[PDB]
Ligand binder design. Structure first.
Ligand SMILES: Nc1ncnc2c1ncn2[C@@H]1O[C@H](COP(=O)(O)OP(=O)(O)OP(=O)(O)OP(=O)(O)OP(=O)(O)OC[C@H]2O[C@@H](n3cnc4c(N)ncnc43)[C@H](O)[C@@H]2O)[C@@H](O)[C@H]1O
Ligand SMILES: [Mg+2]
Ligand SMILES: [Zn+2]
Length: 217
């Protein structure tokens, strides 16, 4: 149960990751969350990633590989893991292959959550996120029970700094450029599985369960 999620901005990685963690009991590793936390604490890593994140650009490969290697060396990952948003370039995928061969934990599947770019701006412009637990809502497609508050913990919802329309536009263009190379890389490895992410959330998850419930230790 060593899984990677890939998708264009707003395609649903975090929403599906939360459901995967709850059903299969593996830890969630999100590079976006790691960088935004370091930004928040203003660590040197934080301050250095911020210039890229704010513009909607990729943080450089070397630093991102490093935080992922460190995270994967923790003991929770022995049973599996769900990488979310990493790799997102070919060079990050090649490093991860090498790390995971050294660790003895090769990827079982890379799940690509496919959504038309033309749907993604509306997903991100309506996204409202819990300041406490990070879960995401959408004003129309997945609202909280009470506006402005998270259902789980009563935390204040906020708008991610990079979800402004002109940032979303750059994020889409930056990540669309990596898409073909990365799908070729993992299809040629025979670990890529695509899912149609333009369905109701529970229907996307049903397809994820066909894939992950088919794995056996
Ligand atoms: N490896 C790496 N290398 C270098 N730089 C890196 C890096 N990783 C990260 N970075 C940097 O960090 C930045 C942020 O990375 P990251 O945090 O990974 O952002 P991302 O990849 O753009 O993905 P998002 O979190 O925006 O979208 P999501 O697909 O998780 O959508 P969600 O489930 O929330 O859902 C979106 C919205 O839609 C709603 N929704 C979800 N599913 C559905 C559905 N099926 N139908 C309708 N609405 C839906 C939700 O409620 C929500 O409102 C990057 O831009 C880069 O600068
Ligand atoms: Mg996310
Ligand atoms: Zn919350």
């Amino acid at each position: 149960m060593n899984i990677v999620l890939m998708g264009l901005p707003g395609a649903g990685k975090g929403t599906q990751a939360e459901r995967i963690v709850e059903k299969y009991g593996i830890p969630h590793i999100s590079t976006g969350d790691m960088f935004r936390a370091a930004m928040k604490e203003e660590t040197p890593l934080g301050l250095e990633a911020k210039s890229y994140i704010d513009k909607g650009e990729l943080v450089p490969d070397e630093v991102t590989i490093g935080i992922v290697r460190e995270r994967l060396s923790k003991s929770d990952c022995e049973r599996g893991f769900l990488l979310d948003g990493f790799p997102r370039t070919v060079a990050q995928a090649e490093a991860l292959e090498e790390i995971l061969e050294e660790m003895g934990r090769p990827i079982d599947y890379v799940i690509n959550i496919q959504v038309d770019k033309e749907e993604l701006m509306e997903r991100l412009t309506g996204r409202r996120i819990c300041s406490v637990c990070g879960t995401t809502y959408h004003l129309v497609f997945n609202p909280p029970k009470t506006p402005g508050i998270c259902d789980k913990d009563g935390g204040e919802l906020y708008q991610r700094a990079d979800d402004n329309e002109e940032t979303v536009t750059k994020r889409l263009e930056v990540n669309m450029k990596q898409t073909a190379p990365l799908l070729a890389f993992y299809d040629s490895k025979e670990v890529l599985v695509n899912v149609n992410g333009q369905q109701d959330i529970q229907d996307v998850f049903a397809d994820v369960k066909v894939i992950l419930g088919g794995l056996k230790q």
